[PDB]
Amino acid sequence: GSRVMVIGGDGYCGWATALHLSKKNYEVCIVDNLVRRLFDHQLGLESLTPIASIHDRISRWKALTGKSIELYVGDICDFEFLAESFKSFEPDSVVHFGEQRSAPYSMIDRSRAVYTQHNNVIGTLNVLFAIKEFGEECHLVKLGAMGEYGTPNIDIEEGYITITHNGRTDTLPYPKQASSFYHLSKVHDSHNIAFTCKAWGIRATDLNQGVVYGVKTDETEMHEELRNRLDYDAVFGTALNRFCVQAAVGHPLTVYGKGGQTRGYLDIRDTVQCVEIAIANPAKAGEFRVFNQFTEQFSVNELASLVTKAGSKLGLDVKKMTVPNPRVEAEEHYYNAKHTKLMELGLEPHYLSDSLLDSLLNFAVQFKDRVDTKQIMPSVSWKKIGVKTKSM
Template identity: 80%
Template sequence: MIVGGDGYCGWASALHLSKLGYEVAIVDSLVRRLFDEQLGMYTLTPIASLQKRVKRWKEVSGKQLAVYIGDVCDFEFLEDAVRTFKPEAVVHFGEQRSAPYSMMDRNRAVFTQQNNVIGTMNIMFAIKEFLPECHLVKLGTMGEYGTPNIDIEEGFITITHNGRTDTLPYPKQASSFYHLSKVHDSHNIAFACKAWGMRATDLNQGVVYGVHTDETSLHEELINRLDYDAVFGTALNRFCVQAAVGHPLTIYGKGGQTRGYLDIRDTVRCIELAIANPAKLGEFRVFNQFTEQFSVNDLAKLVTRAGAKLGLEVKATNVPNPRVEAEEHYYNAKHTRLVELGLEPHLLSDALLDSLLNVAVQYADRVDMDQILPAVSWKKISSKPKTVVGTA
């Protein structure tokens, strides 16, 4: 069962697992599509309705996806879905996943925390009550760790203090109300594993880039999202779209912000590996899910070079950083456990950048230039709700 299966990572994962022979159910409230309508910003790639996607997947693959439309914050709906489908694994992507969205105003900050934390707790209780053997695979974020001046371990750190040694959860330094919701999730899941004997894998994922997987490439109605706006668009995807339309790459602040990155094709493979190698009953394990580390300046240089090969004149500009974050810092995060399980990463290559840039060029006429510059400030968050970004 893939919660959030209509979203960017969830849709690609649903098709990948279905192709592998898993019986897959999608659970989704379709709220991500509602955000587009509310904010007046849309994916660069035109995506079909979930109903059309599922129908086309059956025609292309011969495989059926079960669909449950509803909100996991509604426990009665969730209970009916899990008791009907009886999943052996629940992959939980079903959260509001944007830091800027969570920092737009009080309403959206509260929504992010309620939706993410309560939805996760409902899934935990559904597993406890109805699916005690079920494996919860929860998408976390590398953003839970922040940017400490020491190496980032995978979930836990062994420390010696006043002559005594213990292995403890790695300290969390979240940098938005969204990232804080993920921290709450991790603590709640760890407690449930200890108290109830639940089995769970917390995937602290880096920044994902790319559009195509083998499955989403099979038909235009299966294509995935490509968000390029300043609320939902991630750095590399945004830069490629900006390059395609001749807009300077928007580097926030000094550009030294360094994070872990991975290809969407590696995301679906990581989900596959986590399911195929489940945690033990009572085990809470953490995998850092990324393949390479880049600074924002690194990405800008890579896109500039790739754009030149395609005849694009790419420039970059430093804009005031809307976030509260270190713009130059040490960053070295461990990410070995998924590789040990068999992950063979797709590293960011010139060929991959060419592919991503070509998608951006193909759909360049769909770009809304008003959505490129940042419009959400961490320091100016207000209790007054925003309506439409760019016009409010």
């Protein structure tokens, strides 16, 4: 074999996924403009782990396994490029990881908020038109976001909710409440895709994924040049990965506000597993499937405690600090998000364990010398965002 186009395949989730699908014998190609690497240069950021170029990454995989991952370098917002890549590869499935995924980045200034929505929304529209025009039966596996739902006072369902209002009943799209221009772009994406499923018969699966943690997967650990990136800076780094790196370098864990913010999380190993499951068990024509893709819920305070305990076993004397929250969000809220669709399809989860934390912490300690502590604290305010293009 089945042919899979992995848009955003040079990224954190995409690279691990591309290697896994190739290993699982799918014919794979990567479509990426590598803009994520440019952002690192422009903002003065760097991965904890040194990573190889996309060309060397692909070359190494071929040298080790003999398998060739085709590469198409370009911006999917450029339809000519996307169309040519689609017609050249003829994918049976498209996994779309190719979007600006940082909430902080989307809040830096007007230019970055606009770039985020334009890049994400238009790129996704182009993908939908490419599928419709060149391969209508192609299954779109889209990366959405648990953040699309916000933090309502009721249980969060997997995309849909059956409501009884004024004596009548109907099943409707779950109300969306995004908290950043980035999360908003995903809400727009989801609405756009749902429409094309009904109007054109597109088959798609929206994976509303929670926060990913970890850096190792079976494939990326096979050789140093296959190593994935591990972000710890305040722009692209996420909660758990950030805390592990902070613990390793002796920086107090950065708890934003009260720390009651609760979210779904999952090991990167499950990210690749879930994507493969979505591909192996495709949506039907005209069907817009929605899966909440995470394995466990944790509050920020809970993560801090887990990392502190894990760090103690390594003599890291982990400390915690309360950082004035740069974001506008509920710091104490109800949270009960449903997640059974992937489990019903055979997901064998890697729940957060002492072993994982020990491994991730030792990893951060291993490359502690590469950590730029100046990038640990957040400097992007949700409320103070301006129109002048900022230079970090």
